[PDB]
Amino acid sequence: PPQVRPSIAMDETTQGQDDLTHKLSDILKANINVQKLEMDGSPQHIIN
DNA sequence: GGATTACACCCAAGACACCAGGCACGAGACAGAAAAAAACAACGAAAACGGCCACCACCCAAACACACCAAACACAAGA
C-alpha cells in the first residue's frame, strides 16, 4: 500500500514518489516489455 | 567472495536529473531461400567389325643313344 511508500512535499506544490514506487514502476515497464517479445519478432538476444 | 567498526544532542548549506540514441515505422539489396533448364547419367534401335571354328605348316618337345661326370660302400692304407 501507499503507506509503506508515502510521497512527500518539496515546496508547497511538489512531490516525488518514494524509491519503492519508482522501482515498482521500472518492474512494470520490464514486465510489459517482456510481454512485447513473445508477441512478435525476438531473435533470442532480446528475450533473455 | 562479504560484514561489522560508541551513544545522545546542536547548527549550517545545496539539490529536489537534462539530453541524447533506441522502437516504430520508413524505404533499398544480396542474402535466406524458392523456381527452372541444359548438359549430366541411363536406355531403345541400326552397323559393321572384332571374335570363334577351320585350315593349315614350320618350330619346339620327347625318345634313343652316345660319352662324360658326380658319387657311394669298402679294401686298403694310415694315427
TrEMBL record:
Transmembrane segments: none annotated. Signal peptide: none annotated. It is found in: Nucleus. DNA-dependent RNA polymerase catalyzes the transcription of DNA into RNA using the four ribonucleoside triphosphates as substrates. Belongs to the RNA polymerase beta' chain family. This is DNA-directed RNA polymerase subunit. The chain holds residues 244 to 291 of 1743 of the full protein.
